[PDB]
Amino acid sequence: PEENVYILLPIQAYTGGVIDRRDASFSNFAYSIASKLMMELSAATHNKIFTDYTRIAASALGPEISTEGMPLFSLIESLELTEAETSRLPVIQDSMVIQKSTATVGNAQQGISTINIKRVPFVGSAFQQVIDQLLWEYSTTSLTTKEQRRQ
Amino acid sequence: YVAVRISRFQLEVLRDLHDLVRSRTYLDVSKSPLATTPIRVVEYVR
Amino acid sequence: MNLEINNFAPAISSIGSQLCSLSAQKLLTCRKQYGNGAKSFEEFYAEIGGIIGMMGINSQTPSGIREAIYRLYQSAFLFGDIFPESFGIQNTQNIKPPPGFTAPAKKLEVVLPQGGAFDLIYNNGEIRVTTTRNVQAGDLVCTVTFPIQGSVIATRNCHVNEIGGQLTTTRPEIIASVPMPARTVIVASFDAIEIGYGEGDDLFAIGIAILSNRFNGQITPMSRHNYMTQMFANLPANMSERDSSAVLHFAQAAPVVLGMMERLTGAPKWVLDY
Amino acid sequence: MNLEINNFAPAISSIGSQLCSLSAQKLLTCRKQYGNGAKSFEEFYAEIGGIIGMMGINSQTPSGIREAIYRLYQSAFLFGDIFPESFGIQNTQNIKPPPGFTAPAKKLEVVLPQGGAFDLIYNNGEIRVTTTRNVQAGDLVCTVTFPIQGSVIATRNCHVNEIGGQLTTTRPEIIASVPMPARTVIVASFDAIEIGYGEGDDLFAIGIAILSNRFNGQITPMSRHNYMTQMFANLPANMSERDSSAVLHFAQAAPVVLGMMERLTGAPKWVLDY
Amino acid sequence: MNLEINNFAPAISSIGSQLCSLSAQKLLTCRKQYGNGAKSFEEFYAEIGGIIGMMGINSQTPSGIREAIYRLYQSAFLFGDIFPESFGIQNTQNIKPPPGFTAPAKKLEVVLPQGGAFDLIYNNGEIRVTTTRNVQAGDLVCTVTFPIQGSVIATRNCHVNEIGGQLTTTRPEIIASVPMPARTVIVASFDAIEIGYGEGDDLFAIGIAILSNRFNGQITPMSRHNYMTQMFANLPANMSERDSSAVLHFAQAAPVVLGMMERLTGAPKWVLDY
Amino acid sequence: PTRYGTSESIDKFKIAWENVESVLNMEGNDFVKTIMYAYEDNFPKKDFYMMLKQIASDGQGAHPIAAAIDQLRTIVYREPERFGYIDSVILTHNPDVDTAY
């Protein structure tokens, strides 16, 4: 709407919910949406783990840079940026560096294991990050290395 | 004549371009690869 | 310290408490999945544990939530913006009650009457005065200025209004019960709770240091008890107990979370279970 | 406060404690889904907060849960005449150990031996008696009647059975160690834990009033310490220490949850973690 | 209690604390889904409450995790010297900070000067000494050997280094402020926290006996305060304050987990939320 | 139990059972369900409903299945606009437009 104000709209992502006036249970309406969501998350993560991401090849003058999410140039016209923002954009394009570390998967019931992970930055909304966190939690709930399983 | 209106609209105001950047989590297949074959267990009786 | 509490403090305090609770939940969530390895826990936390988004607060680094805490605290209590940045679209018409106080009342604050007939000393949970001159039964000797609630034990040579072992009023007054000349001593002990919280005192010690380093004029380092007593004494008189509770909860939770971000340990229950 | 405990109290108390823990868990799960809607927190809780499906509960409202709590409390502690067939109390085969006690022993109860040889006064955690006449060593001066457990500190002119600083017996007795003249004092401080829990005292004060209003003739408002001492003194002697703990847990948890459902604040750990 | 602690203690202690936390979480999870039935709770826990898997330990029985605790405890606190020192210093793997200490300081440990001018008696969080002779103002009368952090209250005829009511140094020293004659008294009360965790003291008492029955020549039953003081005094001279915290957390968490596996009650927060 | 009649409550329970079995479970003959369905008419309606309520009440508590449901139900509650619903709506002659938006 103005110079430094950027607004993200809440577009509908998951459709669910059955309305029955005879029973007035909000808890029942939430369960119907949640159950449909649980099946969709389970379908996406079945027999699959998230390993593939877009990137920029590590050249001689730069490190690994992520290009995941909305292209930065789409924003040029979607936000109608002035020259200051357009100048700023290449700076924030180069700060999107992929991080590497180790994490712990599983819980007290399934078990505990350490694996190698990556943290790839991307451009998007905040609900996107919540959904991705849920998907990662669903996919890695039962992960075991060959050493641990053999032992 | 009568108007049907809502309350409590939720929207996100970012105030900066660097706030559009978030993070995900991936698997590092370079050092934690995916197994292609289950371990084969051969058992005998005692 | 000196500070100016604005009329909108009960509403800003709710946003501050929600921010603090979300930060604590994220801290424990990241603490659960740290895989011991080459990277230190500070590096692991600084990369994932600061990404929290709520109305008017869109940080992605612990520096961001530290800045947000600074802004909300400055606005709510110190000489600061009477009107917060995104207060308009917050829609804080209805507020969530804060958890009840759990701080033990070891040192309790009292003030003698103008007569000057008493010499008062402090103990771990009790007060005792010595009569400088003759005193008649049935007169005021003490009164508490810092509200307190709980049981009463070990009452000697004085009377406290209580039924079933529980104090009737939140501000008891001690009254002599027997004609007691020639330098008598009266003792009043309490198993009671005072405004404040008991856990996370280590975090408070460094949080207050940080936010007295930033606001070096208005705030000085001190103990939790003195800080809470001054904060309560600076509250406006025309205020209910429902809003003062939120104000005090935020006033103590901000230093606790600020010091919590420094030492990457757990969180108190009264902060996390908001 | 007059009341009788029927012989099926542990079975009643297991169901009561399970109900209280479920209500507390639902309460906490609700406080984290409020916001982003036009509905007071009280109305939000009164909608989805009370939905627990257990045998004997015939409503999905906090009023139904409080009615069930009333019924269970009446049967076990006030009248051994009515037995509740609605709940699955007939078909219980085993009970679960309740959480360990956490209430600090500040005012500890002792009974002086006959003969008026000593004067008893109470301190924050210590009992000091004075010898009105000459008494030889080797005879008891005080015995505790309200069980405590913990370490002993600052013992003077007395002997208490301990190994490595930890008290051996659950009901320690204080005896003289060296013969002493009259007018001297002997002290005994304890870092002990008494029966019952400590947290939730604010929710206890407003729940005991509610259930004293409902049960006008049997229960009166009173402090937690006196209530727990009387409830323990009314227990039958032929009872294993596992059953009495289960009885006392519900005895203290019912008022706490009753006051919890009024002031929609957090929950104590011993109620949740059952 | 005689024991020697090597320089690999933090690495062993991190694994031990993680194992204790996992076992506590497993116990609570199995406790919240226990349906009363023919099978008792002890049998129910033994079947699917000891099966916890992680790096190194691979046992599916409570005896297995008991033996894992035994192995870790012996390797950390009773084995003489694991490796040459440089092997440990060059370790790169990092650990996680333990929760902050919450044990109240009641019997604070202090030592008198070589002169013998004063006599020391203890109370609850209070040290009071009397002068046998006349001594000049401005000299040390008592120093604290057990580290302590927190506020200071009720100081008479003595001065301590504090700003805003909060102690500045971890080992405060008490000095005279005004010239005094013989047979006077100087007092110093503290609202502070010492090394250790206050909750779960009942489990410690029965776990220390369990792990003393095995290491009979090295470990004997004693109070928690004495145990923690001896463990702190037996730490190696050269160690950072970060590593000693982990060592002490494991040293106290092993007995409480051993006793919690016996009495199937809840686990304390400082063990559970590691 | 209070919301409907005994037969209607039994039918609602059967619908819920079928939905649960279809949403998560894979196909297989439910032994208990078949036993209860085949011999439904040997009991009065009140006792049949009491048995069904007992079955539903055997599993009550804070358990991993419940927490998994809560983790999603707390996201459905906090983001109504994403899932396509509104908590309530208001009707009036003269709306008071909010200046904030």
DSSP D77-135: II-SS----SSTTTT----PPPPPP--B-SS--EEPPTT--EEEEE-SSBEEEEESS-B
For residues F16 and F33, the answer to whether their CB atoms sit within 8 Å is no
Q: How far apart are CA A131 and CA F47, in angstroms?
A: 44
Q: What share of chain A is helix, strand, coil (3-state, %, to 5)?
A: 40, 15, 45
Q: What is the resolution of this structure in A?
A: 3.1
Rounded Cα–Cα distance for residues D46 and D27 (Å): 10
CB E62 within 8 A of CB E43: no
Establish if D272 touches chain C: CB-CB under 8 angstroms.
no
Q: Which residues of C32-50 are buried (b: 16+ CB within 10 A; e: fewer)?
A: ebbbbbebebeebbbbbbb
Residue A3 near residue A82, CB atoms below 8 Å: yes
The H or E element containing residue A74 is helix A72-78
Residue E7 is classified by DSSP as T
Rounded to whole angstroms, how far apart are CA atoms C49 and E267? 27
What does the DSSP 8-state code read for residue E121?
A: E
Q: E14 — phi, psi (to 5°)?
A: -60, -45
Residue D265 burial (CB count, 10 A) = 20
E268 DSSP β-pair partners: none
Asked whether D103 and D194 are in contact (CB, 8 A), the reply is yes
**Number of H helices and number of E strands within chain E?**
8, 11
Nearest residue to E184 via CA among E134, E234, E220: E134
How near does any CA of chain C get to the CA of D92, in Å?
34
Query: D122: closest CA among D182, D176, D190, D175?
Result: D190
Q: Is E125 exposed, middle or buried (0-12, 13-18, 19+ CB in 10 A)?
A: buried
Do residues D99 and D249 make contact, with C-beta atoms less than 8 angstroms apart? yes
Give chain A positions within 8 Å (CB) of F19: 35
Non-local CB neighbours of B5 within 8 Å, separated by 6+ positions: F89, F90, F91, F92, F95
Neighbours of chain C (3+ CB pairs under 8 A): A, B, D, E, F
Judge contact between F9 and F49, C-beta under 8 A.
yes
Structure tokens at E156: 């008479």
Angstrom distances, CA of residue A57 to CA of A61, B25, D173 = 11, 19, 80
Nearest to D125 among E124, E201, E220 (CB): E124
Query: Which backbone phi and psi does C24 adopt, to 5 degrees?
Result: -65, -45
Q: Give Cα separations from D112 to C154, D97, D127, D183 (angstroms).
A: 17, 34, 11, 17
Q: Is A115 in Cβ contact with C35 (below 8 Å)?
A: yes
**C-alpha–C-alpha distance, residues D149 and E202, integer Å:** 8
Q: Strand D148-156 relative to strand D185-194: parallel, antiparallel, unpaired? A: antiparallel
Beta bridge partners of A118: A100, B26
CA distance linking residue D33 with residue F75, whole number of Å: 8
Q: Are A22 and A31 in contact (CB under 8 A)?
A: no
Residue pair C38/A103 in contact (Cβ under 8 Å)? The answer is no
> Rounded to whole angstroms, how far apart are CA atoms D256 and D17?
11
Nearest residue, CB atoms, C122 vs list E125, E154, E164 = E154
Size of interface C-D (CB pairs under 8 A): 77
- E126 and chain D in contact, CB less than 8 A: no
> CA E191, E197, E202, E206: dihedral to nearest 10 degrees?
-140
- Note the helical H segments in chain C: 9-32, 41-48, 62-76, 201-214, 224-233, 241-262, 269-272
Query: Nearest Cα to D222, choosing from D9, D70, D2, D19?
Result: D2
Structure tokens at A136: 């990662």
- Count of H helices and E strands in chain C? 7, 12
Which residue, among E93, E85, E61, E69, has the nearest Cα to E21 in the 3D structure? E69
User: Pairing state of beta strands A55-56 and E110-111?
Assistant: unpaired
| Structure determined by | cryo-EM
Please tell me the number of Cα atoms within 13 Å of E59 on its side-chain side: 15
Alpha-carbon radius of gyration of chain B? 28
List the end-to-end C-alpha distance of chain C, in Å, as a whole number. 27
Diameter of chain F measured on Cα atoms: 66
Name chain E contacts of D164, Cβ cutoff 8 Å.
Answer: 220-223, 226
Query: Chain F: nearest CA to C87, how far in angstroms?
Result: 9
d(CA E242, CA C106): 30
Q: For residue A111, which residues of chain E lie inside 8 Å, CB to CB?
A: 52-54
Please tell me the distance from the alpha carbon of residue C162 to that of residue C166, in angstroms, as a whole number: 5
State the first-to-last Cα distance of chain B, in angstroms, to the nearest integer. Answer: 87
Cα angle at E60 between E54 and E65, to 5 degrees? 70
CB atoms within 10 A of CB A91: 10
Q: How far, in Å, CA of C190 to CA of C212, rounded?
A: 33
Cα E110 to Cα C113, E197, E207, E225, distances in angstroms: 38, 20, 28, 14
Residue F89 sits at φ, ψ, to 5 deg, of -135, 155
**Residues C244/C195, Cβ–Cβ less than 8 Å:** no
Interface-testing mutation among E26, E31, E32, with chain F (most F C-beta atoms within 10 A): E32
Q: Look at the alpha carbons of C162, C168, C170, C175 in this order and tell me if their dihedral is positive or negative.
A: negative
* E81-84: long-range contacts, CB 8 A cutoff, minimum separation 24: E81/E6, E82/E6, E82/E7, E82/E8, E83/E8
Q: Nearest CA of chain F to the CA of D270: how many Å?
A: 15
From chain F, the residues in CB contact with E33 under 8 A are 61-64
Alpha carbon of E53 to those of A144, C92, E59, E76, E183: distances in Å?
11, 46, 7, 21, 64
Closest CA to D33 of C96, E134, C137, A145: C96
Question: Comparing C-alpha atoms, which of D211, D27, D9, D215 is closest to residue D92?
Answer: D9
Give the C-alpha separation, E124 to D123, whole Å. Answer: 10
| Alpha helices by DSSP H, chain D | 9-31, 41-44, 62-73, 201-214, 224-233, 241-260, 269-272
Q: Is C89 on the interface with A (CB under 8 A)?
A: no
Q: What is the 3-state secondary structure (H, E, C) of F21-88?
A: HHHCCCCCCCHHHHHHHHCHHHCCHHHHHHHHHHHHHCCCCCCHHHHHHHHHHHHHHHCHHHHCCCCC
What is residue B29's three-state secondary structure?
Answer: coil
CB D235 within 8 A of CB D247: yes
Q: How far apart are CA A34 and CA F83, in angstroms?
A: 10
CA distances F69 to A30, B14, F52, Å, are 10, 31, 22
In angstroms, the CA D74 to CA D78 distance is: 5
* Count of A-C CB contacts under 8 Å: 29
CA C249 to chain centre: 6
**Number of neighbouring beta carbons within 10 Å of residue D16:** 29
